[PDB]
Design a protein around this ligand. Structure first.
Ligand SMILES: CNc1nc(Cl)nc2c(Cc3cccc(Cl)c3)[nH]nc12
Length: 164
């Protein structure tokens, strides 16, 4: 069912995450972590304190799809587990140094063709697929986007709800 999902998405904030390769999204799904550039890291840390749920919606560049979405479970933290990200060009391991913990809500794909009817007021009402890494997505757009994803029956939202 979608009732627990809607409860998780209630009053959430949504951010578009653009990854330059598939390997880091695979790593994020396996290990429950994400790292981003310092400009976006500051935005997510601020949002994490401000909202019941902060939702990251992932898209690998050139894939024409979203690869799933997840909820922040912590602010960024340094040290510890040094994630072996596959670094793109012009990207250093110190730029991706802050590590957020994330709980996946959906690890299923959604093609961009399925979200063509959703526009993002915080990006000039362009289709929600369009946006830079870290672009915030307005509440109603982000909620409907997340509801378009196929259900992920491998995930039990019960423990996610407890962390709220
Ligand atoms: C684990 N974190 C990440 N992995 C990858 Cl492959 N790409 C990421 C981007 C997008 C981007 C924006 C500006 C410059 C560059 Cl080079 C890339 N943001 N976070 C990323």
């Amino acid at each position: 069912g979608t009732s627990k999902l809607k409860y998780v998405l209630q009053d959430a904030r949504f951010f578009l995450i653009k990854s330059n390769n598939h390997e880091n999204v695979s790593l994020a799904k396996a290990k429950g972590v994400w790292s981003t550039l310092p400009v976006n890291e500051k935005k997510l840390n601020l949002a994490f304190r401000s909202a019941r749920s902060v939702i990251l919606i992932f898209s690998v560049r050139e894939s024409g799809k979203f690869q799933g979405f997840a909820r922040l479970s912590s602010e960024s933290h340094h040290g510890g587990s040094p994630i072996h990200w596959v670094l793109p060009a012009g990207m250093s391991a110190k730029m991706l140094g802050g590590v957020f913990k994330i709980d996946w809500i959906c690890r299923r794909e959604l093609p961009f063709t399925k979200s063509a009817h959703l526009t993002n007021p915080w990006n000039e009402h362009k289709p929600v697929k369009i946006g830079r890494d870290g672009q915030e997505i307005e509440l109603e757009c982000g909620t409907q986007l997340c509801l378009l994803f196929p259900p992920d029956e491998s995930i039990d939202l019960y423990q996610v709800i407890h962390k709220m």
